[PDB]
């Protein structure tokens, strides 16, 4: 194993040999945004796609144009951390090259009139960290992938809209990437109709006229031919046999001389078959059969030139006469099978009043621009703009793909613009589905739903900015001068950066990151939603989208989605998933060939999956043969079933890919219900890190890669030897081979100490290593807030036993010991931030100074010179942090205090206090202060003491850096002289600088002397430039608001501990609030006196079925026991060999354990440290659905010399006796939560009041009154407490006379009530009277 694995191994009972190892988890953010930047020449992605798709642009007249060239980005001015500290966006410059080519409208296109090829900055752009956040005003923020109906086309059918009909109505819809929608539909009367974007209904055929088709060409396209021949008097006609199918003979249908079908007889498939086999196509028939048939195409007499029948008109017998007399012994007609080939289009034509292309354009123009006097090109241009202009309609070649496949083309690609072939093919497949062939499609299938990551949205808003530019570009091109108006004398970068900024800071997807837990971060990045733009709404959407669809398998976790109104909408991504290039999804599958499971992989998409047949990972493979058992669990078609062995196409990879990470971590999930796992994995994200990092024993194996891939830890970039160690930084020297030749290869890592999280928690780092040891590359060099040796640790493992206790664990509540509290182990941190702003007023500036009137030296004892707190303080409500004061106005006084300062002579200044203080209820420890000030105002002294010290710190931190880096170099400057003789001790003893004068020679060594001269020169010089830019970055003032003169900021530390009310839980939904802490003596305990830490009520196990905690508990009791054995082996201090035997005997225990590890490979001290790190408990991996078994649990517990049932006689402590029976016992891994009473509790006597209604507020942050809803009125209406009601209606809320009067009657003792009138009432009267109404009262 690896080094960070050698020291603390996690056992495994997984058996399924994994072919694959997990991927990098945060790949999608990186790759998406990368495509948004990455300089694609041809297969345009994001930026270049927007420039190409928009530029070039030419004038409003047609003479001048701007031309795209290329782009380039600057490195950002500010690094990451100054952007965190300052409250500043992290972002990089943008620079586009632009060429103003202009054309003479004198010359035809004599382009050489003007060229201005210059460069333009416009707009910053935020960038992505190595981990995925975007820093914005000093806030780490995350922006979330979206999921929505892909572009293309989508067919549907509502069942009984007119429920009186009880009838089916089919419809089709076209939905592009950009541009307008399009709806096709049927009616009860079987008439095709159109509406655009849901404008009004229109007879569909109108559009086809507008598309320059005649009724002839239309019916040629839609209707197949039925050809008659009037052979000299009588009617014969051509007939394919499968035309009279399920059809009934109207006449005696006979043949050459032969009767197939009689009158009143069905043309059975027998007679279709005789009509087929007999080579019979022509049949003699009655003329009367025609009458009712419709002509297909216009017929005249070549003598007349007159329509004997216009096209699409019903035939007769006088028209059979007159046609054949006019020279028609051929009459093509329209096939019409009301069953299969319906008269939809023709009826729609007979309803359609429009005859020409033009009027069709007019009535479209009238649908969308109602009223307006129509004109030709307004309407032609309108229609052609809608779906035939590149500007206002683009499909996304994605959309072109899906569309084409929906029409069964071969062409993936095409245009973002429609063609008439496309429209009419859609109408054809529509009516085809109206006949019965094919099917409507479904929403909930993933193959209709497309992911939209960051870079695509950024592309969108970027282009919108380009339009905001483009209007004024043209207005300023055609009008203003050409040769002199530079390209950037037109450009304004404000709409662009305003757009990018707007999206990064106002959209629903843009939001603060959940920093309470690395798990919560990574899963907040692996989030997927259908809301936001191009999406849905809670009040609108229903259950269908919320529910699962079987294609979620291997792509979306069904186990992680909230319990509130967002139950189905939000959902998280699965583990081995990826994205289709188009935006759809895919998932790995092992290909199954000849029964042999092929170890290659293919990423089947949302749609390929159902067509093949797919097997499970549960399959007990026949050892590189095939599936052992005949009836193999496989699936296809959107359902599972049992199939054969050689018959298979594909297999799942692992036993996991259905899941997300969170539910990949809950062990013994297979022994649990989905509801309580939902709640477990949800609350698994709301954890808080403990003060320490206590690992879990019951594992899954994914813990490590999550502890790494959050990026929170240090990572060995290039493995090597630990050079320097500290509590704040680490230095490693890089291995020689890994050391690139140019660079010295000495990596250094600066670590983060106690620092605020966005949820006000402790962020911190610590080395998981010693000094002077090799490092395998990729190891963890530093742990974080919730990690240990490279594994996650959200909480702490401890002793548990299931029984009631005197009512203290009544309904899921918890009882807990004192011993836990003495070990601080659930104690946690809540760093906080507080600020004070120095403003400029109408009267003068606010001033930060120690001096404040009417203050005692008690408070002031801790403010330094400038009126600022010394670091190290420990403070409480009422204390003062920053003495700020404000020049004051003046006062209209009362006679009394006037007399009182006429007595004492005391006075005010012309100034008021505005200090920064602790808010009531709070206490804690000041540990850091920061100050920001304008470039232009004096730095208040302490600021100089801060920034100068920030240079003492900084320039030291760099001196060290350069001193080490350069000191290594200073070997060269020693040795290089020494090549070319030797000064064996004349070199060393005399001072090191003066060796250049020692042993010297000609040809090659003078260049050497001056090479060292260069080295010296460089080495000081780089320092000086470093120092220059660095020091000015420290000293340069701050970009603040107007009126804001300087700011202070104060960071605290508060150390909150467990109390009744502080919720806790585990990883199965096994919630619980605390009701008491129990002394060690009143606890239950055992024969050996080791008491319990936590007690639980198993009433709530069976009905909740969260059974894994039981098995987990058993296993925990096992693991600790082994550690206890080893602990006995250490204090008794046995020997190497006994540890060797015992440990290797412990690893090789399970039935068919996948992993096999030997210890003779390891050396002695490895055995030592590993036995020493296991003594608290041997940690184990229970993969989620490849779990362990009762045989293995109980085998292990027998190795522990414990009761196999894990269930022991307990003795009560208060009474000293035994209980009746045994009780289950063992170790749960358990957690604390942010839902702490310290942050929830709130009271209110009397305080603030609002502004319009004057009734109090809500929220503890605003000293809020609690709401008394209508329900809570209806109750008192039930009882009859009119007085309690009136009390809550007048004095506590609105009646100001009442509240003041009441306070005064109280302090006089009197508990007496007077009412007034609520102000919101008379407010309402005033409003109504504003609405033009004489509302008024009938005074008594």
């Amino acid at each position: 194993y690896s080094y960070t694995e050698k020291k603390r191994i996690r056992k495994d009972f997984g058996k399924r040999p994994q072919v694959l190892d997990v991927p990098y988890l945060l790949s999608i953010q990186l790759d998406s945004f990368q495509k948004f930047i990455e300089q694609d020449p041809e297969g345009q992605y994001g930026l270049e796609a927007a420039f190409r798709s928009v530029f070039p642009i030419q004038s409003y007249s047609g003479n001048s144009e701007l031309q795209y060239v290329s782009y380039r980005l600057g490195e950002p001015v500010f690094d990451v951390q100054e952007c965190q500290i300052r409250g500043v966006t992290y972002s990089a410059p943008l620079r586009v090259k632009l060429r103003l080519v202009i054309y003479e409208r004198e010359a035809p296109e004599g382009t050489v009139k003007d060229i201005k090829e210059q460069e333009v900055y416009m707009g910053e752009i935020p960038l992505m960290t190595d981990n995925g956040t975007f820093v914005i005003n000093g806030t780490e923020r995350v922006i979330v992938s979206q999921l929505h109906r892909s572009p293309g086309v989508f067919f549907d059918s509502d069942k009984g809209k007119t429920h009186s009909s009880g009838k089916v109505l089919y419809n089709a819809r076209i939905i592009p990437y950009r541009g307008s929608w399009l709806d096709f539909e049927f009616d009860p009367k079987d008439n095709l109709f159109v509406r655009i974007d849901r404008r009004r209904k229109l007879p569909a055929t109108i559009i086809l006229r507008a598309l320059n088709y005649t009724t002839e060409q239309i019916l040629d396209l839609f209707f197949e031919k039925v050809i008659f021949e009037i052979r000299d008097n009588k009617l014969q006609m051509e007939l394919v046999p499968e035309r009279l199918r399920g059809e009934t003979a109207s006449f005696d249908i006979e043949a050459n001389g032969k009767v197939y079908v009689e009158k009143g007889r069905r043309i059975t498939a027998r007679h279709i078959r005789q009509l087929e086999k007999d080579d019979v196509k022509l049949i003699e028939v009655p003329v009367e059969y025609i009458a009712g048939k419709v002509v297909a195409k216009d017929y005249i007499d070549e003598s007349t030139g007159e329509l004997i029948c216009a096209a699409n008109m019903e035939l007769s017998l006088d028209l059979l006469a007159k046609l054949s007399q006019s020279g028609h012994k051929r009459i093509e007609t329209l096939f019409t099978n009301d069953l299969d080939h319906g008269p939809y289009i023709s009826e729609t034509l007979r309803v359609d009043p429009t005859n020409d292309r033009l009027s069709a354009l007019v009535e479209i123009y009238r649908m969308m621009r109602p009223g307006e006097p129509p004109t030709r090109e307004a309407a032609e241009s309108l229609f052609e703009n809608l779906f035939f202009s590149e500007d206002r309609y683009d499909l996304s070649a994605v959309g072109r793909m899906k569309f084409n496949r929906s029409l069964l083309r071969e062409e993936i690609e095409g245009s973002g613009i429609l063609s008439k072939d496309d429209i009419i093919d859609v109408m054809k497949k529509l009516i085809d589905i109206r006949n019965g062939k094919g099917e409507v499609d479904d929403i909930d299938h993933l193959g209709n739903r497309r992911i939209r990551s960051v870079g695509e949205m950024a592309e969108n808003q970027f282009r919108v900015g380009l339009v905001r530019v483009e209007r004024a570009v043209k207005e300023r091109l055609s009008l203003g001068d050409l040769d002199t108006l530079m390209p950037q004398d037109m450009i304004n970068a404000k709409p662009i950066s305003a757009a990018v900024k707007e999206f990064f800071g106002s959209s629903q997807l843009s939001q603060f990151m959940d920093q309470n837990n690395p798990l919560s971060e990574i899963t907040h990045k692996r989030r997927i939603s259908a809301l936001g733009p191009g999406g849905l709404t809670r009040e609108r959407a229903g259950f269908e989208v919320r529910d699962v669809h079987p294609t979620h398998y291997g792509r979306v976790c069904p186990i992680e989605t909230p319990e509130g109104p967002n139950i189905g909408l939000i959902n998280s991504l699965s583990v081995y998933a990826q994205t289709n290039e188009y935006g759809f999804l895919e998932t790995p599958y092992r290909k199954v060939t000849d029964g042999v499971v092929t170890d290659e992989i293919h990423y089947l998409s949302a749609i390929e999956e159902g067509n093949y047949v797919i097997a499970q990972a549960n399959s007990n493979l026949d050892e590189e043969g095939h599936f052992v058992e005949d009836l193999v669990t496989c699936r296809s078609k959107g359902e599972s079933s049992l199939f054969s062995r050689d018959q298979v196409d594909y297999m799942d990879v692992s036993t996991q890919q259905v899941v997300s990470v969170g539910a990949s971590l809950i062990p013994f999930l297979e022994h649990d219900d989905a509801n309580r796992a939902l709640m477990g994995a949800n609350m698994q994200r709301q954890a808080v890190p403990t003060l320490r990092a206590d690992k879990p024993l019951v594992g899954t194996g994914m813990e490590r890669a999550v502890a790494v891939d959050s990026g929170v830890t240090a990572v060995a970039k290039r493995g090597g030897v630990v050079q320097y160690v500290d509590a704040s930084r680490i230095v490693i020297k890089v291995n020689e081979d890994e050391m690139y030749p140019g660079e010295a290869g000495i990596d250094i890592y600066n670590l983060t100490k106690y620092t605020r999280s966005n949820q006000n928690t402790c962020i911190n780092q610590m080395p998981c290593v010693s000094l002077g040891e090799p490092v395998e590359r990729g190891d963890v060099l530093a742990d974080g807030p919730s990690t240990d040796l490279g594994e996650l640790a959200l909480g702490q493992n401890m002793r548990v036993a299931f029984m009631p206790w005197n009512g203290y664990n009544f309904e899921d509540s918890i009882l807990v010991s004192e011993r836990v509290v003495q070990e601080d182990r659930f104690t946690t941190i809540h760093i906080q931030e507080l600020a004070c702003v120095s403003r400029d007023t109408k009267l003068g500036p606010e001033e930060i100074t120690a001096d404040i009137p009417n203050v005692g030296e008690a408070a002031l004892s801790k403010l330094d010179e400038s009126g600022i707190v010394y670091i190290g303080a420990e403070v409480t409500g009422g204390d003062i942090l920053v003495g700020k004061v404000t020049p004051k106005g003046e006062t209209q006084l009362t006679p009394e205090e006037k007399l009182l300062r006429a007595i004492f002579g005391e006075k005010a200044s012309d100034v008021k206090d505005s200090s920064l203080r602790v808010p009531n209820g709070v206490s804690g420890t000041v540990i850091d202060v920061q100050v920001f000030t304008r470039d232009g105002v004096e730095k208040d002294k302490r600021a100089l003491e801060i920034e100068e010290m920030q240079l003492k710190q900084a320039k030291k931190d760099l001196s060290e850096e350069l001193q080490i880096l350069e000191a290594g170099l200073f070997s060269r400057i020693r040795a290089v002289l020494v090549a070319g003789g030797v000064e064996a001790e004349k070199l060393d003893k005399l001072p090191r600088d003066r060796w250049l004068e020692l042993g010297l020679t000609d040809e090659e060594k003078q260049n050497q002397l001056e090479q060292l001269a260069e080295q010296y020169d460089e080495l000081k010089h780089e320092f000086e430039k470093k120092l220059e830019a660095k020091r000015r970055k420290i000293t340069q003032g701050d970009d603040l608001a107007p009126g804001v003169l300087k700011i202070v900021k104060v960071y605290l530390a508060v150390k909150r501990r467990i109390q009744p009310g502080d919720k806790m839980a585990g990883r199965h939904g096994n919630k619980g609030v605390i009701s008491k802490i129990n002394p060690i003596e009143d606890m239950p305990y055992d024969e050996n006196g080791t008491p319990v830490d936590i007690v639980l009520n198993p009433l709530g196990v069976p009905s909740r079925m969260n059974i894994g905690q039981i098995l987990e508990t058993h296993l925990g009791m096992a693991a600790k026991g082994i550690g206890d054995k080893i602990n006995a082996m250490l204090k008794q201090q046995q020997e190497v060999a006994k540890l060797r035997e015992f440990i290797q005997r412990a690893y090789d225990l399970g039935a068919d354990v996948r992993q096999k590890v030997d210890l003779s490979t390891f050396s002695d001290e490895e055995v030592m440290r590993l036995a020493e790190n296991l003594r608290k408990g041997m940690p184990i991996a229970t993969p989620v659905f490849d779990g362990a078994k009762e045989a293995e649990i109980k085998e292990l517990l027998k190795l522990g010399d414990l009761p196999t049932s894990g269930q022991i006689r307990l003795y009560d402590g208060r009474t000293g006796e035994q209980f009746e029976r045994p009780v289950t016992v063992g170790y749960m891994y358990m957690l604390k939560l942010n839902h702490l009473v310290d942050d929830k509790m709130h009271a209110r006597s009397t305080g603030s009041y609002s502004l319009v209604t004057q009734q109090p507020l809500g929220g503890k942050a605003q000293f809020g009154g609690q709401r008394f809803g209508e329900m809570e009125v209806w109750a008192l209406e039930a009882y009859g407490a009119a007085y309690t009601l009136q009390e809550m209606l007048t004095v506590k809320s609105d009646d100001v006379n009442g509240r003041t009067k009441m306070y005064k009657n109280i302090v006089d003792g009197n508990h007496q009530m007077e009412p007034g009138m609520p102000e919101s009432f008379n407010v309402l009267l005033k409003e109504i009277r504003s609405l033009g109404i004489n509302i008024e009262l009938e005074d008594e």
Binding site: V120, N492, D935, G936, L1251, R1299
Partner: protein, 79 residues
């Protein structure tokens, strides 16, 4: 108004030249007038922000609900 026009028009060109925005130091220089008037106008250019905006991203808190009234009295002061 005219001063604001000149300001926001010049700031664009200064943005081209610098590649960055101008400071009231550099801009008071370019604007020919001293920093006091610049800073003054910058303090004047702000609009109101519409009490009925949802500062609760959910339809929970229209900003007017948040506002306190510090005008009337407090009953303890009266007593």
């Amino acid at each position: 108004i005219e001063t604001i026009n000149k300001l926001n028009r010049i700031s664009r060109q200064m943005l081209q030249e610098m590649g960055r925005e101008p400071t009231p130091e550099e801009l008071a220089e370019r604007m020919l007038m001293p920093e006091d008037k610049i800073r003054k106008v910058l303090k004047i250019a702000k609009e109101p922000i519409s009490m009925e905006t949802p500062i609760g991203d959910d339809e929970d808190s229209h900003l007017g609900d948040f506002i306190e009234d510090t005008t009337l009295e407090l009953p303890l002061d009266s007593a």
